[PDB]
phosphatidylinositol 3-KINASE catalytic subunit
Amino acid sequence: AASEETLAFQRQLNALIGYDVTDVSNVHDDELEFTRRRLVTPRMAEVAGRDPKLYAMHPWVTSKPLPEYLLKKITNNCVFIVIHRSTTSQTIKVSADDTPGTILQSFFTKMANERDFVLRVCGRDEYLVGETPIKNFQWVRQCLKNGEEIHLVLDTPPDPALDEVRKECDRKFRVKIRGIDIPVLPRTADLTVFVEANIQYGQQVLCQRRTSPKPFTEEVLWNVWLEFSIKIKDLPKGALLNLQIYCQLLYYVNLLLIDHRFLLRHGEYVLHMWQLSGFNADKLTSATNPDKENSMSISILLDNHPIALEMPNQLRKQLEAIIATDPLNPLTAEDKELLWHFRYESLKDPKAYPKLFSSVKWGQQEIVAKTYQLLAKREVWDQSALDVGLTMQLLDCNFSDENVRAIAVQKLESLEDDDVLHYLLQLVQAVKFEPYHDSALARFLLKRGLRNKRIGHFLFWFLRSEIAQSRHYQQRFAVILEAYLRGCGTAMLHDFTQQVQVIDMLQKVTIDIKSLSAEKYDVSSQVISQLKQKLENLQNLNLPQSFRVPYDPGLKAGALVIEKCKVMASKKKPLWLEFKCADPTALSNETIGIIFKHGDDLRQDMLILQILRIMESIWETESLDLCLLPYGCISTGDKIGMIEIVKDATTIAKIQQSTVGNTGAFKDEVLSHWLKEKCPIEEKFQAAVERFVYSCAGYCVATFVLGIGDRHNDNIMISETGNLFHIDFGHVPFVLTPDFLFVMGTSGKKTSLHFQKFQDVCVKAYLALRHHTNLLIILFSMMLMTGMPQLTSKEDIEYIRDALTVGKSEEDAKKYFLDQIEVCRDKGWTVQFNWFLHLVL
Ligand SMILES: Nc1ncnc2c1ncn2[C@@H]1O[C@H](COP(=O)(O)OP(=O)(O)OP(=O)(O)O)[C@@H](O)[C@H]1O
Ligand SMILES: [Lu+3]
Ligand SMILES: [Lu+3]
Ligand SMILES: [Lu+3]
Ligand SMILES: [Lu+3]
Ligand SMILES: [Lu+3]
Ligand SMILES: [Lu+3]
Ligand SMILES: [Lu+3]
Ligand SMILES: [Lu+3]
Ligand SMILES: [Lu+3]
């Protein structure tokens, strides 16, 4: 039995999730339900312990110091803020150390609990509340950087009652391979086929056995016992039995040998397989293919609980040569032995943990034993200061051991909310490397999401993103999302519903509109009146009147402005939508622009954009502001999603087309001429030129390190404020064309004033990233493994190593980047003209 209401609840949950989590149709064990049942406690333990008030106003703060760029603009010890009562308003100087209370307890003495209000950000759902210095608020810091006033408004604190959560042996190992079955055969000359079985741990193969090659029929039997050299008692918790079909790898499937319950896996199994799209997180999944009618299946038998709990010389000082912090530097049998033999000496240094645990022989019970003793005393580690870079490497595909991974997650615990937001996307992707559905990392994410609405809002869209287009991982992520959705609150549950409703309706339009004309780029007037009408059709009584903007939670969107909506003259025929701001206190009339697009895999864009945000914080710790513009983007489904529209900005390519020919030979003057005219007032033009210098640099260094600098002009944009920024990330060192150089004041290839400033920044920016080589290397490799198709592991990943110029000394590095800036100088328009040709051919 089950209370109708409850049943109805779980019904909406699944609607939010985008998948039916109750489904037990696709599970060969009760790990999903078991997990779906185990998270209930940690979730309820979070809801109960959080402060309903601070949770309702989700203050966004940071405990870091104000970088030079920000502090300098405070050479007054204080700062003022315009407070809006009603249509009223008054300025009040305040010191950087004032508390939100000391701000009102003071503001009221100037006019004259009597003070039953709170400070919110005009036209935003952002509150300055709690025992924190106003200088430690994110909003404040951003206003400072963008030299803007801090317009706040007096209003009543939200009611926490809106967030209330609804009511509740010893012999060797062997496996019998019975056979492979598939309904339809792939018309391909008819080849041979054999099954490969691997015992795998942390992406390493411990033992491997094969069957005899037979003709590729539709039912191929073997009934052969494959015996491995490993002994049951030596199978580590978290090992997988990888089953592959070859002839070229065609299909694969995995099965955890030791289950969530610590029991060896016995029984007959019929496992449905994944097909190779043509290394990455997907090949590691324990999920089976749900397409049980069309998929290849393999049948096996398993039949044989256990698991359930002097100071060296120069030699050892060569161990330090190995601990060369090179994440992408493999280890030799010799290297590993050295590391393991001198274990305890290696333990006295955190930066060597990854290398040390990768020298462990996980396939030997007795050794795993000593490892667990080595961890028993985590002094050097527990006392060490957090290093995300080091922590992330311990969460990647190379480590399957729960305790090793648990210490990494232990360090994450130290992260303040603002830091959890910079790495959240990558931590959610790292869940794919966990051997079991329930893990310390799945728990950490659940918790921080339940404790802070901002993180929760994002955890939600990152999880949903994957649930929607990832068969390999959607079950595990749904169970994680459901557990979050049973604790976020009724208010958020409502917000999520309105947002889900809106995108589900807008993408339907996006695609339908795409069919009407996915061939010729001739955007007709009818397709346009068509879009409008469709929008009118929804605007009626279906489309939610208002909703929070998925990539910017504090912004509230209202009615669509049908008059400004259009279909862009782009291959993908993206929709360009504009909405009003639902908030009356909005200190402006500017609309909220959002592009909806079908055709590009926006998950790659989400990953690039977040990396970029991480670089900005790295540069901040060093007091540098490259003016990047990592606009919001959220991947909603397979090749579909939304993009934040950066206001009054244009493509660099379009600029060339307007002045000069839309096909002719690009001109230099073009860009600067466009800027001058865009912002007449000679005082604003100067500043624009200043932005263009730093932003241009920021992107050149950023894109260069990411191996993504060579792109067409059409994928680069500029604001009427001088900000340059790259866009539309689908997948010469970088783009620094004559027109860019021109804006900096440089004809031919000589004179250089602003060019001087340019060079300087690039270097200081480049060498600032090098101080974080290990962090950038695990991020770059995790990105490739979780967001790119079948990659060239370590090969595709060996690029960033050269780009960061590992080993080489700073000065030599400085010169290496300087030469890169030079290769562009000599190339000029050659590359662009070729890209144009390419789009022509
Ligand atoms: N973040 C943004 N801010 C403002 N305008 C944007 C943004 N992203 C894209 N655009 C606009 O959308 C257009 C690019 O759209 P989109 O990226 O969908 O094109 P595409 O056909 O997919 O790309 P390509 O052919 O270069 O691979 C440009 O005309 C640009 O002005
Ligand atoms: Lu169902
Ligand atoms: Lu059961
Ligand atoms: Lu069951
Ligand atoms: Lu059951
Ligand atoms: Lu405007
Ligand atoms: Lu404008
Ligand atoms: Lu405008
Ligand atoms: Lu484009
Ligand atoms: Lu594109």
